[model samples]
Target: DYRARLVYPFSGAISPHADIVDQATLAWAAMFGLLTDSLRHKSRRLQYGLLAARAYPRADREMLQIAADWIAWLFFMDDQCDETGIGRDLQRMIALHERFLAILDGATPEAHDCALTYALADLRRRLALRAPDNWLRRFSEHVRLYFTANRWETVNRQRGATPNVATYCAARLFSGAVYACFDLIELAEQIELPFYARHHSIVQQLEQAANNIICWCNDVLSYPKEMQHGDRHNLVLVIQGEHQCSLPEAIDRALDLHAREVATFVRKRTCVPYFDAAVNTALEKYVTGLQFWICANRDWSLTATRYA
Candidate 1:
């Protein structure tokens, strides 16, 4: 019933401002496409298709390449780990920060990349130590790869210095981070831990569903703003509005609902023993964090302080 209301906007409520108007949306859609494909379902097909319509083929190929790599990392790799996504987000954050530094001290790609790389590496290592799970490691590799490689050069060389690069990077990165989190809950139900929480395959399916919802939402809403500020941006924040952190709330909402929906399904399917507040709270905290972050960042972003 609620979905029907979108066709006719009553009152003053309006579609989100330039939300899904940039490369970020494309990355978000592709991530969802890959993730939903991984789960073998029709989760975000329409939305994903729409993004394919909008995204550049080269960008789509690159993003899909990254997504495919992520899928491989999750299932095939074992006993191996690298930097977590914290570094990636930090570098993105620094990229935004450097906009201001570029004003005062000017900028150098080699020097900036050096500092950004160091900061990002530290951030990734820290995040990995905090949560060295297979899910996180997969996300981390994507983050580090963009920075360590001359991907920046490649990206900049495109269109003779595009500004929307950060947003593009952001959309793709967040897609992976969100995928890991939604799976964590489903994973809980999939495992038959003797003393720990047990998990279920159905829950994993639901995890993908929830993530799909957010991917669509963010893709729809993030593009315009990201493109407008495509190039260099602010350094530090003396005020809140300049930072543009209040965007991912709706995406988080979709994620939380999916989590809750799966929880409800779990309750109905079987009387799992530890299906009490423990799991409930764990899911709740993740949603809460997502909600909080939706403000400063997009739904797909992952940070060193994500768990903390």
Candidate 2:
């Protein structure tokens, strides 16, 4: 069957901070009470720490810690939304998103209902410590997109529905964990690529390329688990169901789509124009950060117990 464990051809680059990322993941997992969570709910192993560490290779200890905390907390959020009783109820997902948004909005509740509230509030406080107000605003905007994406997935799952290719790609980009994490690239490296430059055609394409690459990889690695759980929105599953094809055939189609996106990314990346040295430096850093995300995520997924 083509549904065999697919090999990713783009090994790309590795971060020198890989070991440090693992250490930080463990430390922050402990700090955030993830270590103490029941084994039934969260994986003891931090899956994406290496991905974030590599994405922000130039980040300092403080920045790495912040990123690590977020990586762990995000997985926790996924668990609550995917593996638990809350996952079946679309309304619960909506309320969960709103409840968390309040903390990000700087609203303090008289009493918190979930452990995530306190953890997210703490991270929000830390983000404000070093991140620019504009950066924080961008992060908040994408987070809302993420939550909307989650709600979208929940709606589809409840109905045993799969989106058409266009709708699926659009929502997949926003909903993937990379959006908010990548938004922090500028903050982590302390480099501002400027609003206009970020919005430039080439730069936006670069961002899209990165998002597609990572999300497709996710769709691939997550297929087995999502299949067992009856997740309706996975790219491979949707392709298979929509086309009435064999599992192996659908997976191969997804692989072909990914390879084409990789080619487009490599070609587009070379055309990034130079601005002032400062902006150029920021531009290069941002793109490199994206590449690291690609490589690191690929590496982590291969061994992460959650997928195993």
Candidate 3:
């Protein structure tokens, strides 16, 4: 039996708007035809809105609702890719990447567009109204990276190849779309960091550390299900193969890595240079947002029916 033994130093909180956001996302999914009878049942069980509620506890009601919808959409798309032949079909995924990126670039959804594409276009429109140009550009770039990483994994799956630990770690950062979600932190709180502070080396380090922690924790928790489905891209599996270790040993190693990343996150947060008072406040909240993601994902994963 797999148990999560990794330590999270931060506490988590849920928005008071969680139930409202939950219903809103479900209705949005239905409006977009994303909720087939089976999917509707699974989506309710997933409680993806609660995940967003916890991740952005301080967000206003409107933005929190948007975040919840985005989370719901992402989970649906992720499930489709992970559980279907589309994940292994390079040509189909390439076409999808083009279509989705076009939507981000302001292309209107065509009559022939799939429900997923249309839903994404709607999300892009809503986000465009709230976020500035620079944030939108950065978010789009992260989305591009996410699509590219999915293509990379698809290629590996097609070739029946398991990536080395180093390669998988790099790809996992984008594959999990953690950076894309990180972008939403600014939108959720309506606090955009100035350009300099945003790109500072320390800030980047914190983001990387938090991303690694979240992805590695997920790898450990999802190992059983991924293995049962013959997916070999998990970090624990990579460690097992690379070090010739048993499953328990590999899991322990994964947890060790998670702990180290958490320490790195704390260290990086402490060392962040102050910009100005106003900027510092935004940075502090940004860092706290990352903490929320780390803690919230772990807490949700532990109880989410999707996992069960």
lDDT of 2 by residue, 1-308 (tens): 34243344444554466667767676666665665446634444554667566667678767876887787787877877677767778888877778888877888744645777777888889999998788888888887888888888888878877898778888888877687888887877678777889889998888888898888888888988887887766778878877899988888888888888878888998898877888988898888778777777777777778778
Q: Please list the residue runs of candidate 2 whose C-alpha ends up more than 4 Å from where it truly belongs after superposition.
A: 1-24, 35-44
How far in Å is the alpha carbon of 107 misplaced in model 3? 0.4
Q: What is the TM-score of each candidate against the true structure?
A: 0.30, 0.90, 0.97
Per-residue error (Å), model 3, residue 264: 0.8
Query: Which candidate number has the best lDDT?
Result: 3
What would the per-residue lDDT of candidate 1 be over residues 162-216, giving only the tens digit for each residue?
A: 3342343344344335544333322222322222332345444433434443443
Best by TM-score: 3
Off by over 4 Å in 3: 1-4
Q: Tell me how far the alpha carbon of residue 4 in candidate 3 is from the true structure, in angstroms, after superposition.
A: 4.3
Angstrom error of the Cα, residue 206, model 1: value is 2.1
Q: What is the lDDT of candidate 2?
A: 0.77
